[PDB]
Amino acid sequence: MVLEATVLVIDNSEYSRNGDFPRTRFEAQIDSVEFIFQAKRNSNPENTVGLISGAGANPRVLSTFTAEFGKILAGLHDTQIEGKLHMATALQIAQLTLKHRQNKVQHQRIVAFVCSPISDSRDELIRLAKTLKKNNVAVDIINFGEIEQLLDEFIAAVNNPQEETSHLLTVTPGPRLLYENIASSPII
Amino acid sequence: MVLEATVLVIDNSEYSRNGDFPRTRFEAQIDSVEFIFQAKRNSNPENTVGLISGAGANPRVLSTFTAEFGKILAGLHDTQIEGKLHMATALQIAQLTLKHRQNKVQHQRIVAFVCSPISDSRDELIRLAKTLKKNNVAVDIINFGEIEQLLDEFIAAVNNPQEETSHLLTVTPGPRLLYENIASSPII
Amino acid sequence: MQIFVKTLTGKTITLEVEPSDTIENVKAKIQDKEGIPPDQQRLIFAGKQLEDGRTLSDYNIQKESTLHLVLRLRGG
Amino acid sequence: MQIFVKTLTGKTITLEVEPSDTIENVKAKIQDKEGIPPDQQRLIFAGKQLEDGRTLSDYNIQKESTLHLVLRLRGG
Numbered sequence A, B: 001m002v003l004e005a006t007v008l009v010i011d012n013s014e015y016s017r018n019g020d021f022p023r024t025r026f027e028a029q030i031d032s033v034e035f036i037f038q039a040k041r042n043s044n045p046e047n048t049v050g051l052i053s054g055a056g057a058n059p060r061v062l063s064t065f066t067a068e069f070g071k072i073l074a075g076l077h078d079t080q081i082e083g084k085l086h087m088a089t090a091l092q093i094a095q096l097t098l099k100h101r102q103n104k105v106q107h108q109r110i111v112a113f114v115c116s117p118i119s120d121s122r123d124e125l126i127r128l129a130k131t132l133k134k135n136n137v138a139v140d141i142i143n144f145g146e147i148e149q150l151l152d153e154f155i156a157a158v159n160n161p162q163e164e165t166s167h168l169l170t171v172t173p174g175p176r177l178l179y180e181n182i183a184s185s186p187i188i
Numbered sequence C, D: 001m002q003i004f005v006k007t008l009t010g011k012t013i014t015l016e017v018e019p020s021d022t023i024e025n026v027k028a029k030i031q032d033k034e035g036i037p038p039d040q041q042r043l044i045f046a047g048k049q050l051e052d053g054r055t056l057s058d059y060n061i062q063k064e065s066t067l068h069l070v071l072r073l074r075g076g
Helices: A025-043 A069-076 A087-099 A122-134 A151-158 A178-184 B025-043 B069-076 B087-099 B122-134 B151-158 B178-184 C023-034 D023-034
Strands: A004-010 A048-053 A060-066 A107-114 A137-143 A168-170 B004-010 B048-053 B060-066 B107-114 B137-143 B168-170 C002-007 C012-016 C041-045 C066-071 D002-007 D012-016 D041-045 D066-071
Touching: A004 A025, A004 A087, A025 A048, A025 A069, A025 A107, A025 A178, A048 A069, A048 A087, A060 A069, A060 A087, A087 A107, A087 A122, A122 A137, A122 A151, A137 A151, A151 A168, B004 B025, B004 B087, B025 B048, B025 B069, B025 B107, B025 B178, B048 B069, B048 B087, B060 B069, B060 B087, B087 B107, B087 B122, B122 B137, B122 B151, B137 B151, B151 B168, C002 C023, C012 C023, C023 C041, D002 D023, D012 D023, D023 D041
Parallel strands: A004 A048, A004 A107, A107 A137, A137 A168, B004 B048, B004 B107, B107 B137, B137 B168, C002 C066, D002 D066
Antiparallel strands: A048 A060, B048 B060, C002 C012, C041 C066, D002 D012, D041 D066
C-alpha cells in the first residue's frame, strides 16, 4: 500500500488489567500490536515499525524500528502493567523517534491505544496535535475502556485534510476481540 | 436508639444509570433511601429525615424533615438522572438544613451516596469536613460505583473521635443489593 | 427498516427507523424506549461516533445494524 | 485456614492464610496468584478497606470470607 514508518504506543497503566476487554485491556493491546505489525509489514515489505510503553513513570522505547517480529516480541515481553498514562510525553518520544526514522521517504505515523482517563491538559494536547500535523505525522488513536473524547478534538486538530490520514477508533466491550475491531477499522 | 435528624443526599448524576448496581445505581439509591428512612424512623419515633438531590445543575431539597413516608416518596418521584455531582454544594445545603432542624436536641447527621468521580477539590472538601465536624454534624458517605477514596481522607477529617459517628461504606458490585449492604453496615 | 441499540448493560432494544432518519431523531426514538434524553446520549457504530444532523444513509447503516449507546458526559 | 479473593472480573481465587497474617502479607499471597504487585492492590471486606499492618484478626476475618480486590490508583 503506502510506505510508512509507524510507532505503536501502548497504555500499560494500572487501568490495563481489566475484565471488559478480554483477556485484559493490556493483553488486548498485545494481540493488537502483533496483528498490526504483521499487517503493516505485508502492505509493503519496506515498512518498519516501532513500540513505546506510554505509561509507568516515564514512557520508554521498547523497540526501535524493525521488520523483525522477534524484537517486537522481545520488547513486548519485558514491559509491565504499572503507573499512569503520560500521553503528551509518549507522543513526544514517538515524534522524536519518527524524525530519526532511517529512509525519510517513509510517511510518518503514530498509532496509540488509550484505555486510561487522560491526565494531561486539553491545551497541551491540542498544541501537541497542531505540532504533529505541522511535522507531517499522522495519528491513529485507539479509544476503548473508559471512552472520553478531547480525543475527538485532538484527532480533529491533528488530521491532515488534503490526505486524510488521521483516525479515531472508539470501541466498546463486546463479542469480537480488540484486534478484530482494529482489522476492520480504517486503520486496516 | 439515638435521637437524630438525618439528611439523605443522593447522586442523581449521569453516572446513576448503570448496570453494575441493580437495577441502576440511581434505583439502588432509591431502595436505599426507602430502607434507611423506614429504619431511622423505628430506632426512635422522634427521628425525622430529609432528602437532597446532590446533582443536576444545582443540588436541591427534595423533601424537608418528616416522619412522613408519603413525602419522602413524593420527593423521590420528581427527581431526575441528569448533570454532575456537586458534592461540596450538596454538603453545604445539607448543613444549612440541619442547623434549622426543629427540635435542636436532635443530633445532626448527613448520609450521602457517591457514585460519581468527584469534581470538587480536595482542599474545599477538607475545609468543608473540618467545618462539619466543628458544627457537630456526623457524616456517612456511601461509596460505590467508581470507588475513589479522598473519601477516606474526608471521613478521616470529619469524624468526631470521642463519639465515633462518621463512617465510610465502600461497596462493590455483587450478589446482594445496595440496601442490604447498607443494612449490615455500621450505619445500620 | 428495524435496527438495534445495545446499552453497556447488554440490553439490546429494537427500533423502527428508515435510512434517511437523523441521528438526533434516533436518539429521540431511543429516549422513549429507555427514558434517557438525547443530550445524555452518545452513539457508537463501526468504531466511529454518530453525529447529530447526519443521517443513517450517511453512515451506511442498514437493517439489523447494532448501535452502541454510551454516556455523553458534558461538564464531566 | 483458607479465604477468598474476588476480583472485579468475578474470578474468585482461594488463598491459605492464618488469622494473624498482615494484610500486607495477604497482598503478597495475592501477588503470586495473580501477578499484581501490592502497591497496585486495594482490599475491600465488610464495606471497609483493609489497611497494611493490620491483620485479619483485627478485621474479624474468618474461614471462607470473601475479599474484594480493586485497583489502588496512586498518582491517578
